[PDB]
Structures are given as structure tokens and as C-alpha cells.
Amino acid sequence: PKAGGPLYLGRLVTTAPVPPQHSSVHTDPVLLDFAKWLDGKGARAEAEAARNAGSSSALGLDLELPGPVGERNLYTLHARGRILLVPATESGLYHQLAAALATGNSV
Amino acid sequence: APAPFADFAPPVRPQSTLRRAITAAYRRPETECLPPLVEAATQSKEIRDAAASTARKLIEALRGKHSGVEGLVQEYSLSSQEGVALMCLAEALLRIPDTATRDALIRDKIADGNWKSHLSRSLFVNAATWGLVVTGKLTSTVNDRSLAAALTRLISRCGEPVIRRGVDMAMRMMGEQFVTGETIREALKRSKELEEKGFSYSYDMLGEAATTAADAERYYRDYESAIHAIGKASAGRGIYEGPGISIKLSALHPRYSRAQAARVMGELLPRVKALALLAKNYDIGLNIDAEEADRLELSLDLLEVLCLDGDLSGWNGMGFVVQAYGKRCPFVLDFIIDLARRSGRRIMVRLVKGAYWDAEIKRAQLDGLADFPVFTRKIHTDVSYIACAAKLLAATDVVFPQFATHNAQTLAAIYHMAGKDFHVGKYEFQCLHGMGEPLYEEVVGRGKLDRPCRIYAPVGTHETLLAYLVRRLLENGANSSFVHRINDPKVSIDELIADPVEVVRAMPVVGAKHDRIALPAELFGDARTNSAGLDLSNEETLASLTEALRESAAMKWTALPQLATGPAAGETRTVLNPGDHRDVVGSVTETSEEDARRAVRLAADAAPDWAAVPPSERAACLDRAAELMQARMPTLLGLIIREAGKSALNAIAEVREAIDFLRYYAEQTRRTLGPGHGPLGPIVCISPWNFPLAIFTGQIAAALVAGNPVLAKPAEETPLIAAEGVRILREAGIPASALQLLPGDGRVGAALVAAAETAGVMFTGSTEVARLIQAQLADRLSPAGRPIPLIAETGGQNAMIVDSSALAEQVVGDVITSAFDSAGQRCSALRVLCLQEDVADRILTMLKGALHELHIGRTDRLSVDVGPVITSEAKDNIEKHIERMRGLGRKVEQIGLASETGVGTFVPPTIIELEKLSDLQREVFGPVLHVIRYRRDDLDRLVDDVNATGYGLTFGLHTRLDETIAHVTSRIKAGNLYINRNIIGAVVGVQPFGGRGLSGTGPKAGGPLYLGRLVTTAPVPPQHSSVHTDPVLLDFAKWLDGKGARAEAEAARNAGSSSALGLDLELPGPVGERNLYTLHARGRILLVPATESGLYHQLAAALATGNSVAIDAASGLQASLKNLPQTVGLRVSWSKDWAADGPFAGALVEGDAERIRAVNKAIAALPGPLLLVQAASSGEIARNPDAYCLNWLVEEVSASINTAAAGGNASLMAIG
């Protein structure tokens, strides 16, 4: 994560905290479609994990940070891009997909 | 048969001189109200100095002793969101009744994270209220994801100790501060301490705004039980020393309104009398709280009867609030003082400033009224208060003044105005529990000012108190409020003790309106004049309207084929009132198909002369027509009421909409139309019966002002108001050759559509009829060899989604209005209510109770809520649907209809409980609400189900949760969205109206793209641009360059820039609402290319506007799109069977005239939505960069958000 930013300290502990201001009201639509698909096949635990990931993801965060006058300093969270998924089990793959899709990524 | 309007709105009683003086001041200009108040409020210099010294002393004592939430936030270093989230968690934990169980959950489960796992209902449902508590700022909706993050963060950081502190704080605030007690017994026990110091109490059981008979009965029994408890505790102390009760009339009847005055006097009055009789027996005060401005005068009729009722004689405990923020206040006081003299009852008069200020501003703006019924500068209310106190203090022998205020300046002014002679019973002050005690502990008692204060003491559970806590917090928490300013270190005591009377006296214009609050007529500023409505709570208006309505029923209304050459002969028949077929409204002469064809030829011959009238002069005709319709509104109302089954309220809205269309299209013309925007030619305007003046006028006005002569074919059911609209337009200067009225049925419409000179068709009506028109036009090409433009605005299957965070009373009101207003005969009407499972039973019970309070009947009575359906055929069609549903086992709730409905065609408002949204097939255009339930996790599937009907007109969402708003509004596909409000009555230029799919081709009526469809070269609409470039368009442009298609790549880049996809505007409108207008992709566009270059141009146009495409595989052009970037490939499909690969949202066609005609026929044959087709030849694509117009490749979406839904207006908290 970026130095001098709110995600940094969470990389230095074994369980990351929720950083200040770190949330988003947006839900990835592909995540939503994935959760419905999991629902349909009866993967109830995974569908719940998918919905939870969709909500806790901060993808789409778009903040203005306090700073000097005459400048607008913006901070935004986007998808990483394409995530390599190395699953072992079907449930693990569904959980990995949920995490990656909820954050806007392809896999 | 009863004479039309003979019983329209008779007053409860003849209006006395004193009552008439009240009504005359209702919306009196602010500059006229203030001078007499300044005069009445003037005091000597000695008194003003003494009052200032007293106020300073009170304020110094207040500031010298001035924290619970603030101390918690400080101790745990909480952010604002953490503080709010903590209080929401505490609120939820306090819903666990058993203390040991709650503490176990805290210690073992909550404190160790995973609070979400243990706590159907968002924890944050009331976060807007807690936000006000924590931050002092109101936010209408809740950022539940921010709060969830904050709660996780604070619990993980601080653990059980912070949860414990939050729970204890919330318990204290909700049990002891926001209320005196949870029950009347607890409240009475806690009142002893301050009663021993010289305070008294008035208890508020928090009932308000009954939605159902059962609600009203519950509030009644709560008041009755409280009176017993209060009277037992009073134990003979009497009405001044002892406690009393306060009631709200709105709690005691579900239809407490002027429109239902007869039910109010017959049903509500006896309930108040029974409570008053009990208060009399215990000799306690019973105060009638004051509510919205439109209930003031009605409440006076109850006060009059009660004070004159001999059964209540001997008791002086009847009390009544008057709101000094209201322009009628001094005249109301004159009436009350006189009533006290006549009755011999020493009426207890509570003078307040007023609690509904923001809402009164919004309401007056929405209703287009002349002025506000309240002041708009806070200092005006203060002067009004002091002036009214002077009037009350001169009448203490006949009334008991009660000065309710937390403002130490107001208090001091009155304390000195009242003078040194005091006895208990002369007057008192009042304050709110848990707010006013610090001030009044400097007042009550011989060691202070030795004046008594009555504490208004809310009593109720957490659920009850939270319902309207936002309104109560704004009373003392807005930037202009004394209690906010006392706590502001930047506000000096000198500022707080400023004398409002002398400040107002010295202003350059005494009583000027607030500069930042628009009068309703000025909502749109310089763009245009807002239409004006009528106040159906104003007795003067009701009396004048009664006469105008009766006069309108004595008119010999006719509709004739008004050809350019003059009225034509034809088959003549009467037009009957749908609510009573014995009431003949007028006569219509219908147009022969021969004369319809002749009218088109005359329009074609007249086209150059009308096109040559400059746009500004055409617009001036529309503006003159709007003035004429405004002046004629009362007469137009009467015709609409009788011809179309509309209530007076709905007819007012109908005429306002017509006026607004005229003025909006006039202004849009003045902004856009020039010599190069040539008219299409004769336009056939076919309109529906259900908005028989507004949509009729809108289509015609738009076509005319764009320079097209018009053939106006109104619905066969409602020709009279259409003929009057044409008469008005002709009087306004539209030449007879430019506007021909052709009454008759669908045959006249079809004959007009098929006429060779018809250059465009504007259709509003059913989807099925639009499909027939689409098929008719598919045969046709213009002389230039291009499709005849069709605007086809069609039906809806409109849903509202309600989650567990919505306020049931608000939902039910918006549902009852959206589903059953106009007997559901609005295209926007709510058809499918979707209730989250956890709240569905409660809301459904309330909805059914509200349904049964509707009055169905002939609409020439103000008390009628729901009129008839337009015809027996419509009635039969609706009833067949109801019986089909009933036959499938679905639960059906229906109002019982009165026998008087038998003379017309009525369908009772009906609620049908469905299992799945697929139980519905097509739009049922009647008063039939369907209800489905959904589990929260299935919300996204539900939105899919709503979209799956293929309709896309209006859509409503009731939620407080930002995550749900963002989710639902991003996934729903409808043209008009409404958040936390009803889904009907879209306003021109504010909610540009129209949908997608089976609901419309667009462009939206009342929006900025409309006129551009009615000319051959569309202008650039005002504000129509976007800085955003579609990224797939950009990828396609680079691909084209890589392929060597250099000119096409440049055209693609130009399309990317020219596209207005991503336009996102807020439109001016009333306060307390945000009205947004955005341009999105249409969806999947069918491309029918002929050449590779044509395909590249079509793809560029479609991609630049955000769309995907299905390309006709029969074009043989597959090899032209080899090696597309993946981003473009995702948007591209090839279609061999167009009907299999839809629905499409538009089409682009390349070819010669006969290829275009053939393709247009094949497109018209596709199932489902009418497609907006644009065609061009290969040569046109080469010559004209705008061969395909990007205006028609985007979809307009209007969203109207009620930002007052949380209970107040945050922006207006800064307006004082």
C-alpha cells in the first residue's frame, strides 16, 4: 500500500484494521451477479461471503483529503486489475472469486 | 342527479368577520405583515434596556453552567461517524429487553468484533437522528457502509468499554432526555422534583399523523389512559399548578384535513370532546398542539365547537397553540380571545414560534402558491412572537397566555412586558423537557424571576420518540436557533440579546422576504415563470372556486373537427361524466377519415407559413397560451373534473402541467432554435385520455414551437378539454392552419398517421397502440427517403421497493397516493409494491387501513379522493384482472363503494398480494396495487425481476441507506426514479418524464432533448455536453487507426467528444428535493450496416454513447471487424435472427431508401419495445458527420430524491 496513506499500517500487523474513512457505498455489479449465482446453486455460505465482501469492499472510495488552499488532493480506490487465483478447493475458489470481484478485479 | 359542484366544499360554518380576517392573512406578503407587528411589539427604551440586562443575565448563567455524547467522543477519540455508529449500536442493543442478555451479548459477542453477525434491519436505520445528536448536522440518508466501517474500527480499537459507555449514554438519552419517561407513570414519578421547585408539566404521548382508524383509536386510548394517570396525580391541583396533557388532532383521525372537514367534525370532534370531558372531571389542562399551516383554520372549527359545548362548561383547561411564525397568528389570537369572551372559557393559549418551518417552505413551493403561510426570516418570527405576546398580555382576564420559548431574549422581552404584577394563573412560560430546564431554572422560583414554567414532557418508548425526533432537534439545533447559538462560542451575548423589534424596524425594507428563499412563482428564476396552483385549504379560494366550477358546468362545451378551413360536420354525440352518466358535460363532433386526410393536406399547405414565423414569436404564442390557461384555470378545472374523472387537486396539477409545458418549450425554443433547425412538417399528435390537457398541450406545443403545423387527435374519451386547449392556443395566436383539432377515435388517429404528408408522429398512449402506429409508419418514408420520426411514450409496470429502514407512515402515504390517485389512471402509477419481508406485514396492515379511509365518488366534491375509471370498458378490463387474481387464490383487499357510484363507472381501490412479480402480464391501468415480499439478500434479484417486465417508466425506492440507494439506482432500468417520495406528478423541466423499453422511445417530454426530435437537424440543447469519453469508443478508435481506417478513427474520436453520455445535472426545483438528470447508454443498439465504412460509423456512434451492439450478420461484414480489442468485442455481437437477440434499445440503419424501408419493416416486427431507428444512406454517412444523431443513442434518466424525508431540510437549517 502507499506510504503516507491510510492502508499502510494495516500491512504491518497480522490482522488489518479498518482505516479511517475506508468504505464505499458502491457494490461491484459482477460481485452481485456472482452472489446470485452462488445462491442459485445452494452455496449459501459462499453467497453470504460474497455479499459481505461486496459491502466491505472500499472499491469506489473517492475522497478529498485536507490540504492547502488552491489545490484539490483526491484519493480514490480502484480495482487492482487482474488477480491470479490459486485455489485448492471449490469453496476456496468461490471465496477467492468473491474477494476479487467485490474489489472490481478480473481473475 | 345532484347538481354539479353544488356540494363542492361548503365550509363547516359561515365565516365570521374574525374568521375571514384570518383567512385574508394566510399568504399576505411579508412586507405587509411586519409593520403592525413591529408597532405592537414596541416597548419603551427603559423596558428594552431592562430586557437586555435580564437576557444577558440569563445567558451568562446558561453559558456559565454548560456534553454527554461530547464527553464520550472525547474519551475514546471517536470520529463523528464512530460516534454516530456507536449510538446506533447502543440503540440496537437497547432493543434487547433483558439486561443480563444484553450484557452477555456485549461482553462475549459484540466486543470481540463480528457485531454484524449478531445484530433484517440495518443497525443504522436511525443514524440521521444520531448524526444530528453527535454532529449537529442533518443528513437525509445514512452512509451505512461508512458507519459499518466506523463501528468495526471503534470496537476493534476500544472494545467492551466503549460499547458499555455508548449503551449507558443511549439509555439515559432515550429514557430520560428525549422523553421524561417511557410511560406516563414513569414520567409522573420523575416530574415531582421540578414540580417541587415550581415547574408544571404538560405531557405529550407522542401520537401524531394517524394513518389508519386503528392508529387513531390507539392514540385515543393512549391519551385517555394518560389523562387518568395525570388527573389522578394532579389530585385537585387544578389547571395552572397541576399537570396537563397535550394532544395532536392528527393523531385522532386518519383523515384530518380540510378536504375531509365533514368527517373531522363528525368523527374527530366527538373524540376530542370525550377526552376533554375527562380532563374537565380531573380539572387538568388539555392542549391542542398546532400542526401544519393547512390545518390551522380547520382546528379553529373544533376549538369553537368545544368551547361552546355546554357539557364542557365549568372547566378552563382547554388549551390551544398558535404559531407566531405564521402570518395569521395575530388574527387567530383575535379570534381566540373573542371566542374566550363569547364562551366564557379562559382559553389557555400557548404561543410558540412553530415546528414545521422547512416543510411549509417546501409545500408552498411544490403547490405553486402565491406566498408562504410562514415568515421566511427568523427575525420576523421573533417580532411576530413579541407582538402576539403583547396582544395576549392585554387579555389575561379572558385567556391564559403560555409563552413557550427557549430564547432568553424572547423570554426577557415578555417578562418585562408583563410587568411586576404577577399571580399564578396570570400567564406562564413553557419549555421542552430536556432542553429548556437550564434556562428556566434561572426563571422559576422566588430567588430567580418568580415566574412559572410548564415543561412539555414527551412520554414514550424508543420507537415512538425516534419517529419525529429530527423535527424536534431542528427546533433548537438549526444555525438560527437560540439553543444552537447559545452553544456557539463565536456568538456573543450582545448578539444574543439583540432586540429583533428594533433590528426589523431599522431594516431598509421592513419585512422583506428572505433573499435566499424563492417564492413559488420564482422557482426557475429567469428561465420561466412557474405555474401557479390554488390553495384548497383557503376558504376564500374554495368559495371562489365553487362558483367558478358551478359556472363551468353551465357552459355548452363542444369539440368539433377544427380544420384550417373551419369547423367540419360529422357524427355528434354527448360526452358524459364518467362518475355519473346522467351528467352530460358536452358534445363532440367526430372527424371523418376523409376530413382527417384533408386536414393533413391543409397542414402541409400551411407548413411554410408557420415555419416562417420566427421561433421567438412561436414561443411567444406558447407563453400567451400559458397566461390564458393560468387565468382560466378555475374553469378548466371544472371541465377536467367532470370530463375526465379527476379530483380538484389532480385537475389543478393537470392545468399547471399544461402551463409548464407551454412555458418550458417556449424557453427551450428561445435557447435553441435557429434557421438551420428546419421543421419536420405536419406532425400528428395523438394523446391519451388520462392527462387530457397536459399531455395533449405538451405534444402540440412542442411540435408547434418547433415550427411544425399540428393535427391534434385527442383521445375519444376527453375531447372537450382538448378543444378548449386548442381554442386557447388559437387565441394565443397559433393560426388555424397550424393547429387543427380532429376529435374521434383510433380510426382518426390511424388515418392521420397514414396520411402521405404526415412528417412525424407524437404518440402518448398504450404500448399496444404505439405498436400499431409503429407498424403503420414502417411502410413510410419521408420525401428525403428517411423514416418518419415517432415519439411513442407508453405504459408502465411501475414498482416501488421498500426496505426495513423506511418509515412505514411515509411509505403508506406515498403508496396510497402513487397507486390510487386518479384511480390509478396515471401512466406513472405504482403497480407493484415490493416490501422487505421483515416489515411487510406491518406496512401491509397500515396500507389496508389507509385504503379504507379513501372516499370514492363523483369528483365534483372536495371530499372525494378517488374518482371513476374513464369508461365501462376500462372498468370491465380492470375487474377482469382483479377476478383472475382472486381466482388464483391471491389475497384481494377492496374498498366498499357507495351506492352513488352505480351511476358511473367506478372500480374500488384494490390491493392484490402476489407471490411473484411474474404474476403480472401487462399494465393494468386502474386502481390496482400489487404487493410482493422479498428477502433482503434477494434485493438484486428483485431489481432484475422489476427490469424483466420490459417496462421502464417510473420506479420508487424507500430507504434511508446509501448502499441500498446506490445499488438499486445503479441496477434499475427506468426513466423516472423517485427516492423516499411518491412516484407520480413529474414536474416539467424538473423531472423530465419518460421511460424506456416498453415504456417509451424517448426523448422525454418536459426535457431538453424533446424539441430536437421535431426538427430535421437537432440543435444543441442547453447544458447538453459531457467531458467524459467512452473508453470502448477510444479503444475502437485506436483499433480503426491500426486497421488503417484513418477517417473513421477520426470520426470515432469526434463521436466520443460529441457524445453527451455521462451528462449529470441537478435541475432547479423546490427546496427539500434534489432533482437529477443524467444521460446513460440506451443498451444494445441493432446495427444494420451496408458498407464497412458505414459499419465503422455506426459502431462509433453507438460506442461513443456507451451502448453495446448487435450487428446484422446478413450484412456479410464480419471480416471488417477482425481482431477487435477485447473491450470492444465485449460490446459487439452478431445477429442472424434479430428477434432472438433483443430487446434492443435503438437501431442504426445504412442503405438506400428501399433498403431502409425494408429494414424498418423488419425492425417494427421485432417483439417488445418500439425501437428508435435512425437511417442514413452511405453517401449521407460520408457527407454528414451527424448522419446518426447521438441525442437518440443515449437514455435520459430523471431521479427525484426527497431530501426532507429524514424529517427536516439540512440546507434550510442555514437559512434564517
Place this chain on the structure above:
Amino acid sequence: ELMQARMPTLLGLIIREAGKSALNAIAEVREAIDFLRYYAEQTRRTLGPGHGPL
């Protein structure tokens, strides 16, 4: 606080050791100060017993 108070001395070292101009040495020390205070504040906003160190 110590880096702020000793900034003039730190500047001299940074100027001579790392080839920085005075303005860029000021920026260097300021950035160190800001990291210290920012991570301190972010810690006060977030870290609790369950966020164990690596």
C-alpha cells in the same frame, strides 16, 4: 518534535551527505516529521489488541 527542533542541524547533514539543496533538505526533514505524526495519528485511529504485530 525533536526533528522539528533540530531541523537546521539535520539540514546541514542532508545538504552535505546527500547533495541536497537547502529547500530540498527542508522538504526531506518535513516529510520525516509528517510521516511520524501521520503514522502516529493513524495508529491512534485504528490499532487495538487484535491487530498483532508481524
